DNA sequence: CTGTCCTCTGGC
DNA sequence: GCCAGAGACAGCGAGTCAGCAA
RNA sequence: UGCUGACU
């Protein structure tokens, strides 16, 4: 027997999202879609990279606005490395 | 800065001037800032490392009759000298111009309010007077504090006067700095008589002296056997013991044995002997019995409950916790942190073991720091404050073991019982010199700690607020290495200024640019600001091999793994941060990049230093004129211009302040020592100070 | 020539023999080589050397 | 070099969080074999309480167990921040959206 | 599942050294597979070429 | 000193500033030229030897 | 420890002396030596020989007899050290092949190259239970105390050409190791008479004790010239005397009284 | 910190 | 019985002046 | 006796 995980009583299993197809496996596996992993430090304000346009390969600095004040980030980007954190998406074959 | 307003030329138009008498309304500031290493120590010692040491004092829980009584520390304080009791009359304070007219120690008054109960629900808090620590002159504890030189003629003082000094009986000790190994930072050493330790020893090992809060210190050795195995051997009350690790790790952490072991193999990821001995270490000790992280507890827990001399109501569980918090890595709250640190150290054990490293000397001051007034004077108040609690619970055990219901009467006649001790053990520790301790203090010294501080000129004077001395038991020493004026001391060592007899080579002086770093800081934004630079955390996702990536440390906690081709860059916006005072980098963070090519040279990563016991001297910062701060190890990588027109384009990073910034206070006073020969000026050194 | 041990003045960990000269610095005087004397006294960095050397003899 | 046009959809409260597993003993060569459940803690109340989370995988032989709370949390999912980026090749338009990191480890119980 | 050769691979403690033919399921959940394993672990490894050598240092 | 005589000695000082990459490059048996950093490398390893009797050539 | 012996002063000893200076230096099987090739239970060699351009020149070796003592020396003390560990752990190529194996019961088949050492590797295997490691640490700590052939105590002679002005015909061939009988053989190639060493051990048991008087005083001597020193040899001659006053050198500390 | 004892111990 | 493993074990310049604490 | 300075 594996002793199967316990839920602890002060947690409850959150429900998938129906009204979530955004991350659903359908359309994270669609041809002309491509998964990336994005790291960076704790103050990053996604939103000074919008409309900006972020590097697939190699290194660049991209400067941002934040509260007015301008911020550079260099942006590396790499090929996958074995090993690396997997995306979990809701699915419909999995109950 | 603090050497503007140096004087071009001499001038003799000072004596003969229409105020030459008149005391001055503010000390000389040049002469303070000479005691000021002495005097900074002690104000945290007393103030604020005060609460810190008795915070950690674990509560002192013993059996009375059927019962179990808890007592715990909650303050102590010091209180400033003043005349005894009340008994006497018309001026509370006490200054230290007697003292000297009587015979007599200026003693302040230690103090703490315990507070006992009884499972928990009956409870009082006492005060008790724990007895007198002496106490420096000008140290926040004084009485000569904030006094101008018109009033500090009024009670006779000097006018002039830094005190960083002790009056143990009128005698003025003045405890000197001593050399450590270095704090929180693993130095790989290859000794020859470590193989002696057991069966299958070798002669490799990374030590590392741990300092909590500067109340604490311990010495653990990570050892490497012929078999590719790793052992650690920690000190206990000055009895050694020695754990594979395995058995270490698998009690820190609550991670699966792969890993544990895809963390000793993170930079040497193709090797094969280290696989193979990375499984000998967890299998072949841990498989065996234990593998879950409670019964590896319970099993260390047994074999080490006798010598660790814990409660005999404690599980086994919780008497492993007593050894992992009191004897390996003191320095680190967390046990995953404690881990990472343990895992970096055997790295770089398998490192100098296949050549790829080269040993750290430990007669080098890039691996060197000092011991300060206050790091004595702490780590001795919060041992005798341990010792204290146990003398009176022994007290306490041993009188009757009778219906404390009613004892509640007599609990403060029985804390007063013992509380009649603190005071003549701390006097022997400064009117003799040598240390009785039941743990020597992490220190490997136990007597010559304070000597008497002689004003037969003011040169023999000065010089004993600014003496290093590298150990007492060096002078018994066949091989003379410890005695060589190797040049990693240029700027932080005078080379002329040693006594030149039986001490040569032992005794030093510290430059006169140089300086001890006394101050604490909060460096919580900094783990938080490395990993903004480019830093990627322990935890994982480096972007490249493990091989290709430098391992950050931040005061013995692992940031972790700057990429090689970022380190460069880090370093450089880091060490402008701190010259420009941004961020919240302390002006003295060392920023270290020790570089790696394919070399056996020393292993490589990004250190950044900040404690409070390095020494540091002042350089202008070419590229910016901002007046740096570098410390020992910081020098090794950077050139430093002495005159201008050596200055360059792409060599010459830094340059010193002055040409003479290399000689000590009195051998700034030797006229033309250049045109002399060198063991002249030794000896004008030595003849300045009788 | 300055020498110590039988040997000129030795490097460092990372291959300079004093913080003012490069790393593996090829021209004499970063090896003790003083050509400096007493009449016109020696400097900084050669005054180090003379005094490795004065200490060792003791 | 090829680039993507940067936009953060995110989360409309921030209450949105996508969810990254890392496996403490390495990777699963095919997990698709693998039912993830996503515990949250029922106190809504407390600040403290209203972000914890469980993660569980079951598999037939073992069950993996990550949380963001306690020392199994460990430090990259604060010092750091991780996101995850979907690229429309077709449009070079990459969506960004915040996410958390569960570390991932094996459940027995004495 | 790519743990290699010396941990469960699917729990997480390290095995055993090999004596009877199955794989030697661990002191906590014995789980077993691949008795023994298809190819002996083979090691592709040789000395340097600067001291032990007189040769590829003729010159340089 | 006589001047007159110290000129020699300054141009011979100035002279000795040259003499160390012939030096050390002859003693490590290196080509007799073309190499300039390839010398500095080899120095580098003599130095962090383990026999370090290359080094005191 | 050294020694001196004179070369005698005749066109054929000065040819020989060539041969003998390159007939007594110690040739070491880690001297000559590529690279070693490990894989690992079966655990195969190939030690990848140097070329002889650049080591026959000065050591006098030829390929057949380095490897002949790979077969009868090497590849046994390699068992000899796998049982030191395993004992505390828990046409033509067929003959010399068969005498090989028929004397050790783990190797298999080595190689043969018949141009120059081309590729000459083994072959172990131990298939029960052995604690497979990289265990090239061995055959390295091994291959480098290996020595193919040595006079016993010498470790390398050298000839300084002149030592004499008056009479600067001399040569000497000094040696950084001690054995006298090993030099013996040579008493048409070397002076045997003028032999020195500064052992006085060595002397005291192939000369005799009155002959280790004078090295003695000889030693003392030389070691006070270095400094310019010179004690008159009426105190030197007396210490020798005393020394060896009961047959024995015997040394002047605390267990001499 | 080195060199002889020198008294085991241990393996052979 | 032959000779490594050690593991104790003993040695470590001459003279002189102070003070201070136990 | 001890220990900390110092002299040739
Ligand atoms: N520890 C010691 C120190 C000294 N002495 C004795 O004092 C003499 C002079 O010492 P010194 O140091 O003045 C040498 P000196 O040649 O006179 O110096 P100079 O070059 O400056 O002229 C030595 O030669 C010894 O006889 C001793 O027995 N034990």
């Given at each position: 027997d594996a002793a199967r995980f316990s839920c602890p009583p002060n947690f409850t299993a959150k429900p998938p999202a129906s009204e979530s197809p955004r991350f659903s496996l359908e359309a994270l596996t669609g041809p002309d879609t491509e998964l990336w992993l994005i790291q960076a430090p704790a103050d990053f304000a996604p939103e000074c990279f919008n409309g900006r346009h972020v590097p697939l390969s190699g290194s660049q600095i991209v400067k941002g606005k934040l509260a007015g004040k301008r911020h550079r980030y260099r942006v590396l980007s790499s090929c996958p490395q074995a090993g690396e954190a997997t995306l979990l998406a809701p699915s419909t074959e999995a109950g | 800065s603090r050497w503007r307003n140096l004087p071009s030329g001499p001038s003799l138009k000072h004596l003969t001037d229409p105020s030459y008498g008149i005391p001055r309304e503010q000390q000389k500031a040049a002469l303070q800032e000479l005691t000021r290493a002495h005097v900074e120590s002690f104000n945290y010692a007393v103030h604020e490392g005060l609460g810190l040491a008795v915070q950690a004092i674990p509560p002192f829980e013993f059996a009375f009759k059927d019962e179990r009584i808890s007592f715990t520390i909650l303050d102590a304080v010091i209180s400033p000298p003043t005349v005894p009791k009340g008994t006497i009359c018309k001026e509370a304070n006490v200054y230290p111009a007697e003292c000297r007219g009587r015979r007599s120690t200026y003693r302040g008054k230690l103090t703490a309010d315990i507070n006992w109960a009884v499972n928990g629900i009956s409870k009082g808090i006492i005060k008790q007077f724990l007895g007198y620590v002496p106490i420096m002159v000008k140290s926040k504890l004084c009485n000569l504090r904030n006094l101008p030189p018109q009033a500090l003629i009024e009670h006779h003082e000097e006018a002039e006067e830094m005190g960083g000094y002790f009056i143990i009986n009128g005698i003025e000790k003045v405890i000197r700095m001593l050399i450590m190994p270095r704090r929180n930072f693993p130095i790989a050493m290859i000794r020859p008589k470590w193989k002696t330790r057991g069966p299958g020893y070798t002669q490799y090992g990374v030590s590392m002296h741990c300092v909590r809060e500067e109340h604490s210190a311990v010495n653990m050795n990570l050892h490497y056997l012929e078999n590719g195995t790793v052992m650690l051997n920690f000190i206990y009350r000055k009895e050694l013991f020695f754990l594979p690790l395995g058995f270490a790790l698998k009690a820190l952490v609550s991670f699966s044995d792969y890993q544990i072991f895809q963390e000793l193999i993170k930079g040497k990821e193709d090797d094969s002997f280290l696989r193979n001995s990375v499984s000998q270490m967890l299998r072949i000790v841990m498989e065996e019995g234990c593998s879950t992280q409670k019964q590896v507890l319970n099993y260390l827990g047994e074999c080490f409950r006798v010598k660790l001399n814990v409660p005999d109501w404690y599980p086994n569980e919780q008497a492993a916790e007593f050894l992992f918090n009191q004897c390996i890595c003191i320095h680190l709250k967390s046990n995953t942190e404690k881990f990472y640190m343990l895992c970096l150290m055997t790295r770089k054990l398998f490192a100098l073991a296949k050549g790829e490293c080269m040993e750290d000397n430990p007669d080098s001051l890039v691996n060197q720091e000092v011991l300060t007034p206050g790091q004595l004077f702490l780590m001795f108040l919060k041992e005798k404050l341990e010792g204290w609690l146990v003398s009176i619970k022994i007290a306490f055990d041993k009188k009757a073991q009778k219906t404390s219901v009613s004892m509640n009467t007599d609990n403060l006649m029985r804390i007063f019982t013992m509380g009649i001790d603190l005071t003549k053990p701390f006097e022997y520790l400064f009117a003799t010199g040598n240390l009785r301790s039941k743990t020597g203090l992490g220190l490997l010294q136990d007597s010559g700690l304070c000597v008497v501080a002689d004003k037969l000129n003011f040169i023999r004077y000065l010089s004993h607020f600014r003496c290093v001395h590298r150990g007492a038991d060096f002078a018994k020493m066949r091989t003379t290495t410890v005695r060589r004026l190797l040049p990693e001391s240029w700027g932080f060592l005078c080379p002329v200024h040693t006594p030149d007899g039986e001490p040569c080579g032992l005794m030093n002086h510290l430059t006169a640019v140089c300086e001890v770093v006394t101050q604490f800081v909060y460096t919580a934004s900094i783990p938080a600001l490395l990993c903004n630079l480019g830093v990627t955390p322990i935890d994982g996702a480096p972007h490249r091999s493990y091989s290709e990536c430098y391992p950050v440390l931040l005061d013995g906690v692992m940031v972790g793994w700057v990429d090689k081709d970022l380190a460069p860059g880090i370093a450089d916006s880091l060490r402008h941060f701190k010259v420009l005072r941004e961020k919240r980098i302390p002006p003295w963070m060392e920023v270290v990049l020790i570089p790696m090519t394919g070399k056996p040279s020393l292993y490589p990563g990004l250190f950044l230093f900040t404690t409070p016991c390095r020494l540091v001297r002042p350089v202008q910062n070419l590229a910016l004129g901002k007046e740096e701060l570098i410390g020992t190890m910081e020098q090794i990588f950077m050139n430093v211009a002495i005159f201008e027109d050596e200055v360059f384009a792409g060599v010459t990073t830094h340059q010193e302040l002055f040409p003479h910034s290399l000689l000590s206070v009195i051998a700034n006073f030797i006229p033309f020592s250049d045109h002399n020969q060198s063991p002249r000026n030794m000896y004008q050194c030595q003849m300045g100070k009788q | 020539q300055i020498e110590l041990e039988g040997r000129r003045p030795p490097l460092m960990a990372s291959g300079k023999s004093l913080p003012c000269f490069e790393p593996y610095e090829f021209t004499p005087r970063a090896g003790g080589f003083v050509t400096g004397r007493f009449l016109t006294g020696i400097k900084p960095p050669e005054f180090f050397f003379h005094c490795m050397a004065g200490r060792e003899g003791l | 070099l090829p680039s993507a046009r940067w936009q953060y959809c995110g989360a409309p409260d921030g209450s949105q969080r996508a969810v990254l597993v890392q496996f403490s003993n390495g990777k699963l060569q095919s997990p698709g074999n693998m039912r993830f459940t996503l515990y949250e803690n029922k106190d809504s109340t407390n600040p403290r309480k209203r972000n914890q989370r469980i993660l569980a995988a079951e598999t037939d032989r073992l069950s993996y167990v990550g949380n963001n709370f306690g020392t199994g949390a460990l430090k990259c999912n604060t010092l750091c921040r991780h996101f995850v980026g979907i690229l429309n090749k077709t449009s070079g338009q990459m969506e960004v959206y915040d996410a958390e990191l569960f570390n991932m480890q094996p459940l027995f119980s004495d | 599942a790519n743990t290699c050769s010396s941990f469960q691979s699917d729990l997480d403690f390290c095995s055993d050294c090999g004596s009877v033919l199955p794989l030697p399921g661990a002191q906590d959940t014995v789980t077993c597979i691949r008795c023994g394993f298809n190819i002996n672990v083979r090691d592709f490894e040789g000395k340097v070429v600067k001291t032990s050598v007189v040769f590829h240092q003729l010159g340089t | 000193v006589k001047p007159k005589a110290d000129v020699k000695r300054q141009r011979i000082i100035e002279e000795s500033t040259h003499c160390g990459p012939q030096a050390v490059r002859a003693a490590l048996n290196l080509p007799e030229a073309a190499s300039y950093d390839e010398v500095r490398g080899k120095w580098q390893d003599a130095h962090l030897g383990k026999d370090q009797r290359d080094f005191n050539m | 420890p050294m020694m001196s012996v004179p070369v005698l002063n005749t066109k054929k000893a000065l040819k020989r002396v060539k041969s003998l200076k390159k007939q007594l230096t110690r040739v070491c099987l880690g001297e000559v030596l590529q690279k070693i090739d490990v894989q690992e239970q079966v655990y195969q060699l190939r030690f990848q020989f140097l070329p002889h351009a650049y080591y026959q020149q000065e050591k006098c070796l030829r390929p057949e007899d380095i490897l002949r003592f790979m077969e009868t020396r090497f590849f046994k003390l390699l068992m000899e050290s796998i049982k030191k560990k395993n004992n505390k752990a828990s046409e033509a190529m067929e003959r010399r092949v068969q005498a090989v194996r028929e004397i050790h019961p783990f190797i298999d088949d080595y190689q043969y190259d018949?141009?120059?050492?081309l590729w000459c590797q083994v072959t172990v295997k131990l298939p029960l239970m052995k604690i497979n490691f990289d265990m090239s640490s061995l055959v390295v700590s091994l291959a480098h105390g290996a020595v193919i052939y040595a006079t016993k105590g010498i470790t390398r002679c050298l000839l300084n050409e002149t030592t004499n002005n008056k009479n600067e015909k001399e040569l000497v061939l000094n040696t950084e190791g001690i054995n006298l009988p090993e030099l013996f053989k040579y008493a048409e190639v070397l002076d045997l008479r003028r032999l020195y060493s500064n052992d006085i051990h060595a002397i005291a048991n192939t000369y005799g004790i009155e002959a280790a008087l004078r090295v003695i005083e000889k030693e003392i001597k030389d070691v006070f010239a270095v400094y310019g020193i010179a004690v008159d040899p009426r105190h030197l001659s007396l210490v020798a005397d005393y020394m060896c006053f009961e047959g024995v050198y015997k040394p002047l500390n605390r267990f001499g009284i």
């Open positions: - | - | - | - | - | - | 018949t141009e120059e050492s």
